[PDB]
Write a protein that binds this ligand. Structure first.
Ligand SMILES: N[C@@H](Cc1c[nH]c2ccccc12)C(=O)NCC(=O)O
Ligand SMILES: N[C@@H](Cc1c[nH]c2ccccc12)C(=O)NCC(=O)O
Ligand SMILES: [Zn+2]
Ligand SMILES: [Zn+2]
Ligand SMILES: [Zn+2]
Ligand SMILES: [Zn+2]
Lengths: 413, 413
């Protein structure tokens, strides 16, 4: 009722994720991560990947309830290390240059019961064990895409105003379809148009080559240095095999990496965050000489400290992204409690790893060369949102000139 | 109206599978193999496993649609061998003495229209790669349970006259709950009494120690030798750690292994069979000197010929089981096209591997000893059914005396 032609649009969505998000090509292997709740979408995705000439789809099924039981009941020794067979599966994917399509529909509070130390122990061990995959994906060795599906518990959280559980799921699918341009008579041209607009903006910032950025808002006075030869990117990426792909669907951001050594001041989150299956609220981060010197949260304080202080590289930033407050997802007024969606409603910063393509020729650099160039090396990448209808940002030029970039949450001069 | 209190009964079923089927103990690792469509049951199973003290439940999610897509579209090279990481997951389970709970819900014709040579190559490669698990399980080194859940495509085939999909599914769950004693006030006691009654038939046969069995029915005249010192088993088993478990739920059979070197005559199958995701109908087999000399089917003839002639040990039998025609699954009038259920409606025979436990002290014999003892070795174990209300069976004593065993498909007396 609130959603037109669900089955047809679900198929159209699945084909878009495969053809334009991951861009499957004859001979590819595709790894799909998707919740068991979303078997209907998984079937559609798998069929199209094979129709586009994939040699193999490997589905990594995920399930919130079973994962919570494990975190609630398994002893630490089953939680604080990653079994070799999981690493072996990882290596099979990498040896086959598998594209990674991650469809997220998870409950934002999936792990609300769980002891903080177990959450921390499991995230650190995963960050360590999965490093080769993170490195490959972050330097675009293979295609990869993060997209969403309308999970029940998630939809319930997003739409308290819904008349039923079924209706809440439908409004969530309507957002996912709307923002991924599924309703457009030609979604592919619609994405081309969207990529082209965002690319105009990124190209302009790339001409500027600011020295640093200065963000001001009620929770926030933060200055970030920008690496020499940095690259602002947006909607499309290109993999090491020359193929175009979309890392995030939906997406509304242009972003680059700050120099992980230059950050000073303080910043306040402006959206709740789902991290380690807990909802984190009111994050305040303080930086001195590039490093987080203090992080607190009104809710989820320990979980955030554990992220920052237990994981390699997690005391510095790997991304600074700009999304105008008047853009569609933001203007919807909807809080998604979901990084993919909320990132695309608000300026965001990532704790941890820079994308290698954030510096000219980064895709070719050793890890040593990336760190030399100012791109944080880390075993995590955790975005949090700082944007609002009040935020100002200036770019600082090499002659000391402050150039307005955002005024009252929007591009301005 | 067909199936009241479904949620209550589903949870009661989950509890039974975990507490009495697998018999989860503190410290155990449980491996649950289950279709994604059965996520509701999976949750309940996993919850109860941890409630009973499991340290870890690993779920191996299956999906017919996605498996069929791979078989239809992947090249032979991805089908005819097993990647290392799958072997590594199997080894993690072995190392952890994982109990194996397999809940089957597959569409009997899930793989219709797949190239026969692909089905054959995959089954062979998997049979070889997974042998350590099958060996451990065929010798009760861990608890294991095969049980069912009412998958939609399977229910539609079992109940082609159902008023609606929902009704077909309810009818199938009703059979699963009834036959697994879920409706009893005290299912455990009901199981205990059921096992008692079958164990008394098994003990009678173990006492007689027949040299051979002679089956007669329209289209059947078959004499099978029995191994010296064989063991007839039923309902309960005891695993290598002294824990009681139920290898099949439901179950109505008493069975042992024939001497694989002794078989003469011919036999007509009286139920269809689902093998490699294809429905096989009208199976007839002729044996001479212990070996299949001809096998034939009205539908699926090639799949059977490939089974028998492409796999080592597959020309000989590993199981001979008795189920009286008046027992409840037989009397229901339903053909399930599913091995667990149809096995428990009808006498059956297994092409391929004998269970090690079918000879005295077999669970500690090597492969060489088992084979010397007359128990067939094979990477396959495919049951087909041969019983009916017209079948007579004699037991044949060592001195040639013919003892009536079944008459008209029921115990003779
Ligand atoms: N800024 C996003 C994702 C991201 C990385 N490379 C990109 C190229 C083009 C668009 C978006 C890209 C981020 O780091 N997080 C979003 C996510 O959840 O992956
Ligand atoms: N006859 C069953 C397996 C089996 C092994 N030990 C048992 C004890 C009690 C009942 C059944 C037992 C068979 O080979 N096939 C059933 C199956 O699908 O596993
Ligand atoms: Zn971003
Ligand atoms: Zn990010
Ligand atoms: Zn049997
Ligand atoms: Zn059998």
């Amino acid at each position: 009722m609130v959603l037109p032609n669900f089955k047809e649009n679900l198929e159209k969505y699945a084909k878009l994720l495969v053809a334009n998000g991951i861009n499957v090509q004859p001979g590819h292997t595709l790894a799909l991560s998707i919740d068991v709740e979303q078997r209907e979408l998984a079937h559609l995705i798998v069929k199209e990947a094979y129709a586009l000439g994939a040699h193999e789809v490997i589905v990594q099924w995920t399930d919130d309830v079973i994962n919570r039981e494990k975190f609630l009941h398994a002893p630490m020794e089953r939680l604080d290390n990653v079994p070799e067979y999981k690493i072996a599966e990882m290596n099979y994917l990498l040896e086959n240059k598998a594209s990674r399509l991650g469809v997220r529909s998870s409950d934002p509070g999936a792990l609300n019961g769980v002891d903080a130390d177990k959450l921390s122990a499991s995230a650190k061990a995963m960050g360590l064990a999965m490093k080769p995959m993170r490195i490959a994906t972050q330097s675009n060795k293979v295609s990869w895409t993060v997209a969403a599906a309308a999970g029940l518990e998630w939809a319930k959280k997003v739409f308290p105003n819904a008349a039923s559980d079924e209706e809440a799921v439908d409004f969530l699918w309507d957002q996912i379809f709307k923002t991924c341009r599924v309703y457009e008579a030609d979604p592919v041209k619609a994405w081309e148009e969207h990529a082209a607009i965002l690319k105009s903006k990124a190209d302009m910032l790339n001409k500027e080559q600011f020295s640093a950025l200065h963000y001001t808002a009620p929770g926030t006075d933060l200055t970030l240095g920008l690496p020499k030869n940095h690259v602002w990117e947006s909607a499309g990426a290109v993999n090491a095999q020359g193929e175009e792909f979309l890392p995030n669907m939906p997406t509304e951001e242009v972003f680059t990496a700050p120099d992980f050594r230059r950050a000073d001041g303080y910043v306040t989150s402006t959206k709740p965050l789902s991290y380690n299956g807990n909802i984190i609220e009111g994050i305040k981060v303080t930086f001195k000489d590039g490093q987080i010197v203090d992080i607190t949260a009104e809710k989820g304080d320990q979980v955030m400290k554990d992220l920052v202080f237990e994981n390699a590289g997690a005391r510095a930033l790997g991304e600074c992204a700009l999304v105008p407050d008047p853009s569609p997802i933001s203007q919807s007024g909807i809080t998604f409690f979901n990084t993919l969606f909320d990132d695309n409603a608000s300026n965001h910063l990532a704790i941890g790893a820079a994308y290698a393509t954030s510096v000219v020729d980064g895709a070719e650099m050793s890890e040593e060369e990336l760190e030399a160039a100012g791109l944080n090396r880390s075993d995590v990448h955790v975005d949090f949102m700082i944007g609002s209808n009040q935020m100002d940002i200036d770019g600082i030029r090499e002659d000391g000139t402050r150039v307005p970039l955002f005024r009252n949450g929007n591009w301005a001069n």
